[PDB]
């Protein structure tokens, strides 16, 4: 018996779930993998912002920490592409997230690491980590061709189709390849899907609509070559090219319109190019193991020009038609060695480092002039730089120690130096303790780290308001980036007990995060500008600021029953006890109060597999207060009732080479419609928690040819 690395040991911690390729095949998503990831315990499909802005662009949220705090990996390497899309006043981004980069049918598995076992992954892992692992080459040449198509009951809702392929195996003696390609379309919902369901709209804004889901068109291709240089050294080269164009269906920040909007309904209004290049060295040695990689990610965000303020705010700019391009260049270097240490206790020490650079060039975001609200000393009113960057060097040590058989202790320390923010120390401890052969106690506590994002950190990043979004006042203000921000830290702990024997599993876990210095728009003026025009002159100057304390707290439960040899009933239950910003007393992240996922899995024959699913969501309650900090009144208090979603499907194995699947999601056709943002603006009432579309009954087919 030799001990696994701390990285691998802590994948059995209470806060880890694994989604397999088999799981994905039985219950396939339309396109974005968030659809299947979201059904793990402690995981929500949530908007980026509590405002409800861009509220249909829902993403993976871990334990109510918000999708910003979900670090997404592909084959262990970070995806930062959504950082090319401007972060607004309310933490809103016009971005679908980073779970759409890999086609579902070329995924081997997905590792969902929540809470204390995630902290080790460093910057961005305060909520957790989602690591998408691709299917890799073997010793024979293998390959596949996978098609999926779905069929909404209601034609106003967007259909999806998808075709992908894999091919891999040995070219020469030392040389092997793996390639995948993928073509996909999730159509947008129709412009008027939410008509009849919208928030009350008056005057100039009469006839406006909050938008349904934005469509997407994917083109993805990857190529990996794996070169066995010696018996102890493998070198991998990998390139990836992914293109995502939208299909625009009327989405604007505040759900207002103009004719430039109406004109672009059904068109491409944003397109994302992601280019990835990585070189990876793996060593298998007499003493242990080695892994080192370099990844360069180039993200290009091309979209139609919008305004930052004054009623060109968050909508296509009719005076400045055309597109701009923001470019993100993200370079990540990593090295580590793994050391089985024999004497004393048989443990495994991991020693490593990491370096990252992020360069952002965004010509649209830093362009707010100071004509109206007055000039701000130290900030040029015009021609401010597009460019921003930050760097983080990291050291770490982790040790996985068998204290005595059945008991493992996993301490780890990560140190990080951010070139602007300064140093961070992230202590880590996870452990597992067998109480009997059937029952285990597992605990964890660690301090995760999230660096400020480049919009929050940039003193050239300026937003302006005539008064509507100003906290504690109704007169005009500025919101300014702040390069002396502290980084966010979160002390995340979990305690879990689990019974496990002959496929019966019963478990319960408690979690709590003490979330420190969450970066958010300031509450009090730190200055006032000078000059400007009329009543707007001498605007208050707010900054991006660190919120002292926030908390989330809840329970994750699991119950898996073997009803018969070919029949399994799997259940998870998550219950949210707290999610609060302790400064404003407001909500941190809007999640269902609970989520109960149930699956009935029947191996009906050798070649036939049938599945039933039910998911019960609890109540959703919106923000209590507006941008001013004042108590919200009217339909901005609206809450979503609890509801369920049921599904059925199967897979038929024609042979070892061909499988087909069919089924239906949302069997009882429960639909919800986006009515607006949380709170209103002039002419447009709020909609509270009614900020997204739940799709109705949707039939599906799939076919996988493989060898």
Numbering used by the authors: 15 to 721
Task: Pull verbatim passages from the article behind this deposition.
In Gram-negative bacteria, Fe3+-siderophore complexes are recognised at the bacterial cell surface by highly selective outer-membrane TonB-dependent transporters (TBDTs). These transporters bind the Fe3+-siderophore complex and translocate it into the periplasm. The structures of pyoverdine, pyochelin, citrate and ferrichrome iron complexes bound to their respective transporters FpvA, FptA, FecA and FhuA showed that the ferric-siderophore complexes were bound inside the barrel adjacent to the plug domain, a position thought to be poised for translocation. Pseudomonas aeruginosa, a serious opportunistic pathogen, does not make enterobactin but does possess a TBTD outer-membrane protein PfeA, related to FepA, that binds and translocates Fe3+-enterobactin into the periplasm. PfeA has the same two domains (22-stranded β-barrel and N-terminal plug) common to the TBDTs.
We constructed four mutants R480A, Q482A, G324V and R480A-Q482A (double mutant) to validate the observed recognition site. Each of the mutant proteins was purified as described for the parent protein, and crystal structures of each were obtained. These structures were essentially identical to that of the parent protein, which confirmed that the mutations did not affect the folding of the protein. Neither G324V nor the double mutant were able to form a complex with Fe3+-enterobactin. The same titration was carried out with G324V and R480A-Q482A, in both these mutants no binding was detected. A R480A-Q482A double mutant and a more radical G324V mutant have the same structure as the native protein, and did not show any detectable binding to Fe3+-enterobactin (ITC experiments, size-exclusion chromatography and crystallography). These results support the genuine nature of the binding site.
